[PDB]
Amino acid sequence: APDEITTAWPVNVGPLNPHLYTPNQMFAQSMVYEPLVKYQADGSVIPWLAKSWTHSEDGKTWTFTLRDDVKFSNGEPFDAEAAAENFRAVLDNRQRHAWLELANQIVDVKALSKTELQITLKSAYYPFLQELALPRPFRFIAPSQFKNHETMNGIKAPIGTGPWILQESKLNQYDVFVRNENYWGEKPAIKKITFNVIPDPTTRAVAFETGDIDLLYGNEGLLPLDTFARFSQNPAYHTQLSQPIETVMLALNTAKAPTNELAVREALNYAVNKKSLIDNALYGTQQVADTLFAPSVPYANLGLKPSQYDPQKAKALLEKAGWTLPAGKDIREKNGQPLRIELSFIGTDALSKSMAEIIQADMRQIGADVSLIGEEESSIYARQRDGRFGMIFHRTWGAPYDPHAFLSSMRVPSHADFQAQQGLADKPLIDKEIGEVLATHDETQRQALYRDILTRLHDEAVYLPISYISMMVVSKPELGNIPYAPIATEIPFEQIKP
Ligand SMILES: COc1cccc(CN(CCN(CC(=O)O)Cc2ccccc2SC)CC(=O)O)c1O
Ligand SMILES: [Cl-]
Numbered sequence: 335a336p337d338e339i340t341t342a343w344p345v346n347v348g349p350l351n352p353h354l355y356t357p358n359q360m361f362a363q364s365m366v367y368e369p370l371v372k373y374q375a376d377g378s379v380i381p382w383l384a385k386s387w388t389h390s391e392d393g394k395t396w397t398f399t400l401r402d403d404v405k406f407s408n409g410e411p412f413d414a415e416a417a418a419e420n421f422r423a424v425l426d427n428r429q430r431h432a433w434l435e436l437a438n439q440i441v442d443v444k445a446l447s448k449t450e451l452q453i454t455l456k457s458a459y460y461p462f463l464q465e466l467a468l469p470r471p472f473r474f475i476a477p478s479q480f481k482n483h484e485t486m487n488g489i490k491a492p493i494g495t496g497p498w499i500l501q502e503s504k505l506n507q508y509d510v511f512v513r514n515e516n517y518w519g520e521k522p523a524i525k526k527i528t529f530n531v532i533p534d535p536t537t538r539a540v541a542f543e544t545g546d547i548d549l550l551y552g553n554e555g556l557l558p559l560d561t562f563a564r565f566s567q568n569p570a571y572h573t574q575l576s577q578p579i580e581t582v583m584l585a586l587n588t589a590k591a592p593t594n595e596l597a598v599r600e601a602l603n604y605a606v607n608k609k610s611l612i613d614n615a616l617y618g619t620q621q622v623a624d625t626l627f628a629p630s631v632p633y634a635n636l637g638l639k640p641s642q643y644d645p646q647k648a649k650a651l652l653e654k655a656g657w658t659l660p661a662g663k664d665i666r667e668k669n670g671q672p673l674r675i676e677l678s679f680i681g682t683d684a685l686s687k688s689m690a691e692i693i694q695a696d697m698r699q700i701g702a703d704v705s706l707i708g709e710e711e712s713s714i715y716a717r718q719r720d721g722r723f724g725m726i727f728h729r730t731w732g733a734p735y736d737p738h739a740f741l742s743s744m745r746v747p748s749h750a751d752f753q754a755q756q757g758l759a760d761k762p763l764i765d766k767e768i769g770e771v772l773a774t775h776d777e778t779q780r781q782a783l784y785r786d787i788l789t790r791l792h793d794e795a796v797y798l799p800i801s802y803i804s805m806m807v808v809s810k811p812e813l814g815n816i817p818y819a820p821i822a823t824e825i826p827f828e829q830i831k832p
C-alpha cells in the first residue's frame with residue numbers, strides 16, 4: 335500500500351521505556367511519547383501536552399495547565415496526576431540523569447488538579463522548557479504500565495500519547511509501528527512503518543537498491559558517502575542533504591602527556607587539512623569546522639580565530655616547545671621522549687578508521703607519531719568515561735542540546751569532555767561559570783559567560799574541530815520531499831506525505 339513504508343535502523347528501537355537510555359532509540363521514544371512543550375526550529379517551544387503555563391517572579395515555581403482531551407493509546411486518560419507520576423518515576427532514578435541539569439534542578443512536582451501541574455525548581459533554570467522538550471527522560475507513559483509503581487526497573491507495555499504505536503518487535507530483525515487512530519492531534523498520512531534491522535552501511539545501501547526498503551534517514555554514517563553521491567545523480571532515486579546539525583571533532587586530553595602541553599594541542603590544530611580530509615574520507619559532502627560550535631549556534635558567534643591548515647606553523651610551535659627532530663628521524667623528541675599520541679576510535683567503524691588514517695598521516699608530516707587504537711564500542715566508551723585516551727573522536731549533540739546542555743555535561747566526571755579538560759588550570763573556573771550561565775537571567779551576563787567559556791575552550795585548544803555534519807536522506811521518489819525535525823535526533827515520520 336502507498337501509505338505503508340519500510341525503512342532501516344542499525345539496531346532495534348529497544349523496549350521503548352520513556353525514562354531510560356541505551357538500548358532505547360531516541361527517535362522511536364519520540365514517536366510514541368510526547369513532551370509538555372514541543373521544541374521549534376527557531377529555538378522556542380510551543381504548547382503541546384501543556385496548553386499554557388505561568389511561573390512565579392523568582393522563576394522557581396512553574397504551573398502548567400494541561401490539555402483535557404488527551405488519552406494514552408490504551409484509552410486511559412492523560413492528566414496532571416499521570417504526568418506527576420511520570421516525573422516521580424524519572425526522579426526516583428535521579429542519579430542516572432546527572433548529565434541533564436534539570437534532573438538536579440527539580441525540587442518538587444505535584445498535580446494541583448486534573449489540569450494543573452506544578453513544578454518547583456532549585457533555581458531559576460533558564461533552559462527549563464527546552465529540556466522538558468527533549469526526547470527523554472521527561473515524556474509520559476501510562477502509569478498503569480509502571481512496574482511496581484516505577485519505570486527505572488522496567489515497564490509493561492510502551493503506552494504513550496503519541497501519533498505512533500509500537501505494533502511488534504523482533505530482536506535483531508525488525509520493529510513495526512502503526513498510526514495511532516485515537517491521537518489527540520493531527521493524524522499521520524502514513525499508516526504503518528517497518529524498521530528493518532541492518533547494522534552495516536553498505537548493506538543498507540544494497541537494501542535500498544534492491545527495493546527492500548523505501549527510505550534511509552540518518553547522519554553521515556547512514557550509508558557510504560561515495561554511494562550516496564552516486565545515488566544523488568541517479569534519476570530513479572531521491573536524495574537530500576540537510577544544512578549542518580552538529581560538530582564532529584577530536585577531544586584532546588589536557589591531562590595526559592604529551593597533549594597536556596598547550597603548544598602541542600595548538601600545533602595539532604594547525605596540522606590537519608580539514609578540507610582535504612572531507613574531500614578524501616567524506617566524499618566532499620560535509621563542511622569544514624574551525625570551532626567547537628558553528629557560528630550559527632546560539633551564543634556561539636564570537637569571532638573566534640580559526641587555526642587554518644598550516645604545517646609550517648605547526649612545526650614552529652613544536653620546535654619552540656622543545657620538540658625537535660633527531661638525526662635521521664621523522665618523529666620529534668623532547669627529553670628523550672618521542673612525540674607519540676594515541677588516537678582511539680571504534681575499530682569496526684570504517685568512516686572513523688578512514689578519518690583516523692588521514693589524521694595520522696597529516697600529523698606525521700609535522701613530526702607527531704599518532705598510534706591508532708581501534709577497539710569495540712564498549713571499550714571506547716570506557717575510555718571516554720575514565721580519560722584513558724590521548725585523542726578521541728567526539729561530537730556535539732545538535733539542537734536543542736547545543737550549546738547549553740553539551741556545556742552543562744562538561745561538568746560531569748563520567749563524560750569525555752570533563753576528562754579531556756581535566757588538566758586545565760582554569761577547569762574549576764569553567765565549571766563554575768557553566769553552572770552560572772544556566773541560572774542567570776541577566777541576558778548580558780549570560781552572553782558574557784558563554785563567550786568566556788567557549789573562548790577559554792578555544793584558546794586552550796581542548797578540541798580539534800573537524801566538520802559540521804549534515805542529515806542525509808535516500809528515498810523512493812513517490813515518498814516525496816522528506817522534512818527534517820527541529821530536534822536533530824528525531825525523525826518526523828508524521829510529516830511525510832506521499
Ligand atoms: C544520538 O545520541 C545523542 C544525541 C543527542 C544527545 C545525546 C546525549 N545524550 C546524553 C546522555 N547519554 C550519555 C551520552 O550520550 O554521553 C545517555 C546516557 C545517560 C545516562 C547514563 C548513561 C547513558 S549512555 C552511556 C542524550 C540522551 O542520550 O538522552 C546523545 O547521546
Ligand atoms: Cl539507562
Ligand SMILES: [Cl-]
Nearest residue numbers: 356357358359
Ligand atoms: Cl544505543
Ligand SMILES: [Cl-]
Nearest residue numbers: 480481482483
Ligand atoms: Cl506490577
Ligand SMILES: [Fe+3]
Nearest residue numbers: 355356433731
Ligand atoms: Fe546520549
